[PDB]
Design an enzyme around this catalytic site. Sequence first.
Site, PDB file in Angstrom:
ATOM      1  N   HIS A 176      -6.992 -12.419   7.159  1.00  0.00           N
ATOM      2  CA  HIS A 176      -5.562 -12.179   7.201  1.00  0.00           C
ATOM      3  C   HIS A 176      -5.209 -10.860   7.896  1.00  0.00           C
ATOM      4  CE1 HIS A 176      -1.938 -14.130   5.895  1.00  0.00           C
ATOM      5  NE2 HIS A 176      -1.434 -12.946   5.568  1.00  0.00           N
ATOM      6  N   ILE A 179      -5.228  -2.621   5.077  1.00  0.00           N
ATOM      7  CA  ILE A 179      -6.596  -2.483   4.623  1.00  0.00           C
ATOM      8  C   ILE A 179      -7.211  -3.860   4.580  1.00  0.00           C
ATOM      9  CG2 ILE A 179      -8.134  -1.684   2.828  1.00  0.00           C
ATOM     10  CD1 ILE A 179      -5.795   0.155   1.920  1.00  0.00           C
ATOM     11  N   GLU A 202       6.556  -7.392   8.652  1.00  0.00           N
ATOM     12  CA  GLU A 202       8.004  -7.231   8.808  1.00  0.00           C
ATOM     13  C   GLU A 202       8.411  -5.991   9.592  1.00  0.00           C
ATOM     14  OE1 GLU A 202       6.558  -8.053   5.610  1.00  0.00           O
ATOM     15  OE2 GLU A 202       7.136 -10.140   5.864  1.00  0.00           O
ATOM     16  N   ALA A 255     -10.612  -9.728   1.840  1.00  0.00           N
ATOM     17  CA  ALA A 255     -11.740 -10.663   1.910  1.00  0.00           C
ATOM     18  C   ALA A 255     -11.604 -11.664   3.051  1.00  0.00           C
ATOM     19  CB  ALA A 255     -11.880 -11.423   0.617  1.00  0.00           C
ATOM     20  N   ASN A 266       0.825  -1.221   0.000  1.00  0.00           N
ATOM     21  CA  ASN A 266       0.000   0.000   0.000  1.00  0.00           C
ATOM     22  C   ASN A 266       0.854   1.265   0.000  1.00  0.00           C
ATOM     23  OD1 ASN A 266      -2.584  -1.178  -0.101  1.00  0.00           O
ATOM     24  ND2 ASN A 266      -2.517  -1.669   2.112  1.00  0.00           N
TER      25      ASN A 266
END
Lengths: 154, 154, 154, 154, 154, 154, 154
Positions: free
Chosen positions: A88, A82, A58, A85, A23
Amino acid sequence: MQIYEGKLTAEGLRFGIVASRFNHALVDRLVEGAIDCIVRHGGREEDITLVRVPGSWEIPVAAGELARKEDIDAVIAIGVLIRGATPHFDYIASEVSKGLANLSLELRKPITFGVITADTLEQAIERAGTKHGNKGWEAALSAIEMANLFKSLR
Amino acid sequence: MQIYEGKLTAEGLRFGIVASRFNHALVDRLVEGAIDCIVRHGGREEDITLVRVPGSWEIPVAAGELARKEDIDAVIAIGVLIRGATPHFDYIASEVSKGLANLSLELRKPITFGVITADTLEQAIERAGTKHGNKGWEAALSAIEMANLFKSLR
Amino acid sequence: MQIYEGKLTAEGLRFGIVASRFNHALVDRLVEGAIDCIVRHGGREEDITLVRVPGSWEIPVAAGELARKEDIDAVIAIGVLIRGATPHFDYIASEVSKGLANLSLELRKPITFGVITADTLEQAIERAGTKHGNKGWEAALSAIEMANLFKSLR
Amino acid sequence: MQIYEGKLTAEGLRFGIVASRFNHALVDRLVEGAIDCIVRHGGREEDITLVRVPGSWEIPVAAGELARKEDIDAVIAIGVLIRGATPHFDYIASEVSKGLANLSLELRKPITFGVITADTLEQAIERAGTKHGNKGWEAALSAIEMANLFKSLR
Amino acid sequence: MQIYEGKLTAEGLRFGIVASRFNHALVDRLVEGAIDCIVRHGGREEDITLVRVPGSWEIPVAAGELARKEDIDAVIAIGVLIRGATPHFDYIASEVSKGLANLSLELRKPITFGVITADTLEQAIERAGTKHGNKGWEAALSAIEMANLFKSLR
Amino acid sequence: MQIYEGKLTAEGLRFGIVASRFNHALVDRLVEGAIDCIVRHGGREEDITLVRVPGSWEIPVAAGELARKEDIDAVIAIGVLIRGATPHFDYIASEVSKGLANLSLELRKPITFGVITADTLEQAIERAGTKHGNKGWEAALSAIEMANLFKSLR
Amino acid sequence: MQIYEGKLTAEGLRFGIVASRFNHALVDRLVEGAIDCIVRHGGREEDITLVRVPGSWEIPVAAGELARKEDIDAVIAIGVLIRGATPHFDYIASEVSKGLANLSLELRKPITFGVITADTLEQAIERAGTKHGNKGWEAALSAIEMANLFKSLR
Ligand SMILES: O=C(O)CCc1nc2c(=O)[nH]c(=O)nc-2n(C[C@H](O)[C@H](O)[C@H](O)CO)c1O
Ligand SMILES: O=C(O)CCc1nc2c(=O)[nH]c(=O)nc-2n(C[C@H](O)[C@H](O)[C@H](O)CO)c1O
Ligand SMILES: O=C(O)CCc1nc2c(=O)[nH]c(=O)nc-2n(C[C@H](O)[C@H](O)[C@H](O)CO)c1O
Ligand SMILES: O=C(O)CCc1nc2c(=O)[nH]c(=O)nc-2n(C[C@H](O)[C@H](O)[C@H](O)CO)c1O
Ligand SMILES: O=C(O)CCc1nc2c(=O)[nH]c(=O)nc-2n(C[C@H](O)[C@H](O)[C@H](O)CO)c1O
Ligand SMILES: O=C(O)CCc1nc2c(=O)[nH]c(=O)nc-2n(C[C@H](O)[C@H](O)[C@H](O)CO)c1O
Ligand SMILES: O=C(O)CCc1nc2c(=O)[nH]c(=O)nc-2n(C[C@H](O)[C@H](O)[C@H](O)CO)c1O
Ligand SMILES: O=C(O)CCc1nc2c(=O)[nH]c(=O)nc-2n(C[C@H](O)[C@H](O)[C@H](O)CO)c1O
C-alpha cells in the site's frame, strides 16, 4: 551570464501548508518545523494558510486548491508515510509525489515535498525533528527559496 | 494563521461509492463499513450512490462518472487486490491508484482510497473488518472529512 | 440508496476487441474466449469489431481509435506478455496498462484489460484457456457488465 | 532518404541551465562542465541563463519557466541524487525525470538530463568530473546537438 | 515567561570565519557554504572577514583575535579533521574544540563549530556538501542565530 | 570581503623551538626539518632560539617562557611520544597538547604542534623524515604562516 | 596569468588518422567515431587523411610519416589490442604507446591515443561504441583541442 536565484529572507511571502493527520505524532513535528522556518526567516505566521487532510493520499487535491490561490506564493506538502506489511505504501507514495509534482508544473507554482517516505518508524522519527533533522523545516526553506526565485523568474 | 479543516459530521453530505466485485467476500465487508461510517456520522443512506463494477481495473472509469455529478461531494473507491502468481497485481494496483488520483485532481473533488493492495489473502482479511480494521470505513471517514473541508476550501 | 450496476446480458451491445499477434498461439485462445463470452451472453458476433496489431505495445493506439467510435460500447484489450531475459517486459506492460487506463478515463468509455502479464510461459498457458481460466473471457464479461452499467451511469 | 542531425558547434545558441543545490560539492562540478562544454564549442557565456534551485525536486518547475522563454534554445537540467536509507530517492528521481521529459514534449523544446541518480556517493563522484566523466558536460553537449537539430526539425 | 531567541535574517550582521588549509579540497566547500548561508540570509559579503590558517590546531589562536574585534558579532570556525593511523587526530580535535569553546565563554561572544571530525574520508565528504549537508553552512546559520540572540541577550 | 592570510616567506621572522630529548634519534630529525624549513623559506638561523627539555611533559613550561619573549614571533613545539605498555602516553600527550594550546590562547601568540603522538615506533619513524614526511618541517611551515598572518591580524 | 587552451571547433583543421586492421570489427567503429567527431565539430571530411596498416605494431611508423606532413595539424592513432594467451599483447601495447609518444615529442605535434588496450573482448566492445563510449571519438576530440591549442602555443 544571467543568474537567477532565491534568497532565504521570507518577508512578505505567503505560504500554504497541507498536512495530513495519519502518523500525526510525527507530522505535527514537521508542521512545527515548517512554521518555525518561515517565521524566523522573516515570514509572518498570519501569512501562512494551513490545511489539514486525513492522509497522504488526500494531500494533492487539497494542495491543488491552495496552489490555485493568487495570494499563495508556494505550497509546502507535509506528511509521513511508513511502510506497512503490504505494498500500500508504494502506491500512496507514488501518487502523492506524482500529484504534487504534476500540480506544480500545471500551475507554474512551487510545491515543495515535505513528505517522509520511510521503510521504518525509526527512520521517520529520525527525520521528524531528531538526528536527521526535520523534513518540514527543509521543505519550508525550499519554499522560501522558490518563492523568492519566482519573484524574478515567473 | 488561516486554518482549514474538515469536521467528521456528515449531515447533508452526499457520497458516491464505487465497489468492485472481484474478491467480493472481502469487498462486501468494506462496503458495509463505508456505509456504516457515513450513516452513524449523520449522513443519510439515501444520499449514498453505490456503483458496482467487475474489478479494480474498472473502478476509475466509473468513479470518473460519479465524481462529475454536481450533487456528489466525494467519491469513495472500494476494492480488494490480492497478489497472485504473476505481476498482474502490480499493473492493476498502479493504474487504479493513478487513475483515481488523477481524476481527483482533474475534477477538483475528493476521491478517497479504500482499495486494499495485499500481498496475501490473510492481509486482505486483516484489513476488511478484522484485526487491522476496515479500509472501507477508513476511506469513508476520509471522504466525510474532505467533503467538509471542501465546503470552505473549494 | 441509489444503486447502479450492470447486468450480464449482452443483447444489442457492440464491442471492440484489439488483439496483438505476439504470442498468438495464446492470444488466439483469449480471442476465442472473448467472442464466445459475448455471443453466449446474447451479443451478436456481427456487432464485434476485431482489430489486430503486432504487439502489446501497439494495443493502446488502436484501442484509442476504436473507443472513439460512437457505435462501440466498450473495448476489450487482448494480448500476452511473457517476461524475457531483459526488463523489456516491464516497460511494455507498464505502458500498455497505463495507456489503456488513460484512454478509458479520457474517453469516458470502458476499456477492459485482457492482457496477460506473465513471468513464465506456464503462467500464460494457465491463463489462456487452461487451469486458471481464460483472460479474454474475463475481460469480455467485464466489458459486458460495464457497457450495461454505462447505459444508466454515463 | 531525408536525414536530420545536429552539429556540435554552439555559435549563436542560447542555453538555460537549472542546477540544484543539494549535494552542491558535486553539482558545482557538473555546472562547471556544462558551461565549459558550451563555451569551448563556440557558445557565449553571456548567452547562458543559470537558475539555482534547492533540490532535484524543484528542478522541473524552474525548467518549465526557462523552457518557455522564446530566446532559450534548450534547457540543461543538473542535479545529484544519492540514495539514502529510505525510498525517498526513488520518488524524487522518478518525478524529476518524468517532469523534465513531460515538459520537453509539452513545450516541444529539448530539455537534457544532467541529473546523476546514484546508489552511492562514490558513484556520484565518478560521474561528476572523475573516472566516469562529467554528466553536466554530457547533458550540455546533448543540448547543443538538439538545439542545432531543432533549427531544421522544429 | 521571558523568551529570547535569534531570528535567521542576517541584515547588518558582521561575521568572522577562520578556515584551515589542511584538507582544503573539503574545507573550501565548507567556506563556500558558510558564505552562501550568510549572503542569502541577508548578510553582506563585505561584512565577512575570512582568516586562513594552516591546520585545525591553529584555528583557536586566530579565532581569539577575530572574536576580540568589537565589530565582529560572531565567529565561525571551519576545518576538516580526518582520523589517520595515529591518535594525533584525537589530540587536535580535543584542543581545537576546547579552545574555541573556552574563547567563546571568555569573550562572551558566539563562536560556532564548523569543524568536521571524521573517522574516514568518506564521512568528511558526506559532510562537506554532499549527502549529509554542509557543516560550514550549518555553523554559519548557527552564528546568524546566535548573533541575533545576543543583540537582546548580551 | 576582508581576507587575512599568511605568506610563507620567513624574512625577518624570529622563532622559538622547544625540543624534547626523549626519543632523540627521532626528535633530532624533526629539529633538522624545522630548521631547514625556516632557513630555506628566508629565515635566518641566527633568529632561531632552540630550547632543549627532557621530555614531552616539559615542553609546555619551556614554551611558555619562549612565547613570552617580545622578540619571538612564534613557537614550534617538537617532541616524539610513542605508546608504551601503560596509559602513561595518554596522560603526557593530553597534557602537552592542552598546555601548548592554552599558552597560545593566553599569550595570543602562535604555538605550533610538531609533537608526534604515535602508537608504534614504525609510525614515529614514518613521520620523522621518512614516508609520511617530517612533522618538524610541517610545524615550522605552520609557524611561518602564522607569524606572517599575525603581522596583520594581531 | 597567461592561459592557453584549445577550443573544440574544428573549422579549417586538418587531421591524419592511422587505423590498424587487426580486430577491424571494432576498429572500424572507432574510425566511424573519429570521423563523426571531426565532421560535427566543423572539420571537413576532405581535410582528413586516413592511413590503414595491418596491426597496432605498424601504427607508429605510419603515424611518423603523417605527422611529418606540414599540412597535418594532428594525428589520431586508432587500434584495438586484446590480450591473448601469451605476453605478446604487452610488448605490442608498450611499443605502440612508446612510439607514438616519442614521435609526438620529436615532431612537436599532437598525436592522440585512440588505441584500446583491453584484457578481454568484452572490454574492447565496451570501448568501441557501446557502454563506455568510443575511444576513436575521444582521441579525435583530443586532437581537435590540441590542434587548436597549438595554433597559439607552437
Ligand atoms: O490502509 C491503511 O490505513 C494503512 C496504510 C496507510 N499508511 C499511511 C501512511 O503511512 N501515511 C499516510 O499519510 N497515510 C496512510 N494511509 C492513508 C491514506 O493516505 C488515505 O488517507 C486512505 O487510504 C483513505 O483515502 C494508509 O492507508
Ligand atoms: O487475471 C486475473 O483474473 C487474476 C488477477 C486479478 N486480480 C484482481 C484482484 O485481486 N482484484 C481485483 O479487484 N481485480 C482483479 N483482477 C481483475 C481486473 O481488475 C479486471 O476486472 C480484469 O482484468 C478485466 O478488465 C484480476 O484480473
Ligand atoms: O529528505 C531529505 O532531505 C534527504 C533525501 C534527499 N536527497 C536529495 C538528493 O540526494 N538530491 C537532491 O537533489 N535533492 C534531495 N532531496 C531534496 C528534495 O529534492 C527537495 O529539495 C526537498 O524534498 C524539498 O522539496 C532530498 O530530500
Ligand atoms: O550517464 C551516463 O551517461 C551513463 C548512463 C546512460 N546510458 C544510456 C544508454 O544506455 N543508452 C542511451 O541511449 N542513452 C544513455 N544515456 C544518455 C541519456 O540518454 C541522455 O542522452 C543524457 O542523459 C543527456 O540528456 C546515459 O546517460
Ligand atoms: O601530522 C600530520 O600532519 C597528520 C595529522 C594531521 N591531521 C590534520 C587534519 O586532519 N586536519 C587538520 O585540519 N589539521 C591536521 N594536522 C595539522 C595540525 O592541525 C597542525 O597544522 C600541525 O600539527 C602544525 O601545528 C595534522 O597534523
Ligand atoms: O555535524 C552535525 O550536524 C551532526 C552532529 C551534531 N549532533 C548534535 C546533537 O546530537 N545534538 C546537538 O544538540 N547538537 C548537535 N550538533 C550541533 C552543534 O551542537 C552545533 O550547533 C554546530 O556544530 C554549529 O556550531 C551537531 O553538529
Ligand atoms: O601474434 C598474433 O597475431 C596474435 C597477437 C596480436 N594481437 C594484436 C591485437 O590484439 N591488436 C592488433 O592491433 N595487432 C595485433 N597483433 C599484430 C601486430 O600488431 C603485428 O601486426 C604483427 O605482429 C606483425 O607485425 C598481434 O600479433
Ligand atoms: O580510454 C579512456 O578514456 C579511459 C582511460 C583513461 N584514463 C585517463 C586518466 O585516468 N587520466 C587521464 O588524465 N587521462 C586518461 N585517459 C585519456 C588519455 O590521457 C588521452 O587523453 C586519450 O587517450 C586521447 O589521447 C584515458 O583514456
